Amino acid sequence: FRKMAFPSGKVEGCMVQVTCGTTTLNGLWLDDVVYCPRHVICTSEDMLNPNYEDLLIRKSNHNFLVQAGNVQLRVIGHSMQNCVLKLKVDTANPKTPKYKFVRIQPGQTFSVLACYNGSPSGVYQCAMRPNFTIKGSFLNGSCGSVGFNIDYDCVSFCYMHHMELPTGVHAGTDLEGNFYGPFVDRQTAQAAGTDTTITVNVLAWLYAAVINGDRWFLNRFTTTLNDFNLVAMKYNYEPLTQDHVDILGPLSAQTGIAVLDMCASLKELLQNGMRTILGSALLEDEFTPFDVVRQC
Amino acid sequence: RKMAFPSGKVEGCMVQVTCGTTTLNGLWLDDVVYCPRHVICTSEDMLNPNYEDLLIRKSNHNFLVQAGNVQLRVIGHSMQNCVLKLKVDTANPKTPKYKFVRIQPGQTFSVLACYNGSPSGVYQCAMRPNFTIKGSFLNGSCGSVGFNIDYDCVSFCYMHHMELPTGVHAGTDLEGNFYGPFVDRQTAQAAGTDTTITVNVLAWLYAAVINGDRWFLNRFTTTLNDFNLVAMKYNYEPLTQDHVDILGPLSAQTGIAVLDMCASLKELLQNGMNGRTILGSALLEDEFTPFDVVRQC
Ligand SMILES: Cc1cncc(-n2c(=O)nc(N3Cc4ccccc4C3)n(Cc3cc(F)c(F)c(F)c3)c2=O)c1
Ligand SMILES: Cc1cncc(-n2c(=O)nc(N3Cc4ccccc4C3)n(Cc3cc(F)c(F)c(F)c3)c2=O)c1
């Protein structure tokens, strides 16, 4: 049962390169605006303690170079919204998909188009971890790469990539430049807090295992939310809420395994351990309930 | 992380093909649509299809090709092995630079899973040694294609034909020749024993080292023959001298000789992981090639 990203085509045609002095990274071109990390206005020197207000006031249109493929776009306007730089350009993107900017919640999944020098290099499927980091595969030069979900023909942009934290995980904002998690866009000592496991996604993935005929961990027992939560907290698993239960309801119906029955399965796996489920030795938590229905 | 190639160049080629009551996906390149030839069958015909007999009874107007909203007009058709080629009157304007390649077991590629000619998702997989792929495919996915994109050229290597009893997948190159000994007929055919792709596992261990993971290394070396005698008792594929040569550059970059990495693998197979992890995995990963690792590292 595979991690599956959305087809990236609608986003590929919006990626550009943005250079400011000696700093280059990626930008998103929608209509006549290009969106990118505001830190592109900084030298490495500046990043120690940047004053973005001042750094921007001292800049103007001619300090920015935007390349769409080989064609240079001329910048005719610059502004900052939170941690995102918005450059107005002379040409509107004729490949602009229908889109919107949404902010996602921890535990939600999305696709990422890793790019280098404005060139798309690959796509993969992630989740917003409970500690507001993402376990992505960004290399140097990936800053400004976006994350998205597609619904019919409408792209929902939810992530812009800003940085790697010391532990190898990533940190970013929404497209309005609001960070996910307690991070700042300056070269200072920052760390992700203790991560937890996304309980409702694990349960979703057990449903997928049963659907695929992997049934060994089912048992005759059931649980309570409180007894389960006591176990959940013991193992660094997110609290399971009624909202969660309700959301799994469609998979509860389609397999005959109610959530507190499935919770009793998960309870036992936490304690005793496992052998394999869907070809995995670890309990997987980056598929949502919605994701399991889409793919199953 | 297993990354797929950006799918947009292929998305622009996907269409819906219908013949009578049967509908699957096709691939619109220039003025041709490629698709599985069993589009011309009913479920009844699938036990013992005579494709030559079924095809000669068809005319151009029997094939409904649909490109999003637009009906393409079929003006010719021929069969090449297990692929049907439908000549249409419009060249696909979104045709990318492309070629058709046939791949070998161990090679990776991206799949664009499509339904009714509509792309729904993209994933990365590999040709298993038993010539199946472990894909993610529902009913209606036939005609979905696998590809690599090496510098702006799309190399098509797979077209999806069928699911086998174990839930693995069988299909052709874009000249319509099947990977492995499978046939496009409902028969008792089954995937042989799946083995692990040793040379890929080694590649991924070299990746772990380059990302600063060394805990699984040991002080030992091995001969090639002793390595293979041992690995095959865990259903690992044999490592050939070619594999060893192929790993040469990763050997040089890290400073760890191939046979030392081999010794390390033997130890991992004996010990398991003792509750720890390698590039985030509690299993040994075999779906990254030497090329994929060099490319992304
Ligand atoms: C392996 C990896 C994975 N994801 C992201 C990065 N990453 C990167 O590619 N480039 C950065 N740069 C360039 C530059 C040019 C001029 C001035 C400053 C910088 C920093 N950074 C570091 C970075 C990003 C921030 F947003 C930030 F606030 C900070 F302090 C450092 C990468 O992390 C690296
Ligand atoms: C879960 C899954 C994953 N990948 C592929 C399939 N798959 C499918 O979607 N449809 C098939 N059909 C419809 C039809 C309409 C008219 C005539 C015949 C068929 C069979 N088949 C079965 C199949 C495909 C072959 F190529 C083949 F040679 C065979 F005998 C059976 C699917 O496997 C299923």
Numbering used by the authors:
A (entry chain A): 3 to 276, 279 to 300
B (entry chain B): 4 to 300
The authors write:
Owing to these features, covalent inhibitors targeting C145 have garnered considerable attention in 3CLpro inhibitor research.
Compound 1 had moderate affinity for SARS-CoV-2 3CLpro (IC50 = 143 nM). Similar to other inhibitors, compound 1 was bound to the active site of 3CLpro, and its core triazinandione moiety interacted with G143 and E166 via two carbonyl groups. The 3-methylpyridine group occupied the S1 pocket and formed a key hydrogen bond with H163, whereas the 3,4,5-trifluorobenzene moiety was bound to the S2 pocket, forming lipophilic interactions. The conformation of the 3CLpro active site, especially the catalytic dyad of H41 and C145 bound to compound 1, was similar to that of other covalent peptide-mimetic inhibitors, such as nirmatrelvir. When designing covalent inhibitors, we hypothesized that the binding mode of compound 1 is more suitable than that of ensitrelvir because the conformation of the catalytic dyads in the 1 binding mode is similar to that of the native state, whereas H41 seems to have difficulty accessing C145 in the ensitrelvir binding mode. The crystal structure of compound 1 suggested that C145 was located near the 5-position nitrogen atom of the core triazinandione; therefore, we decided to pursue an approach extending the warhead from the core.
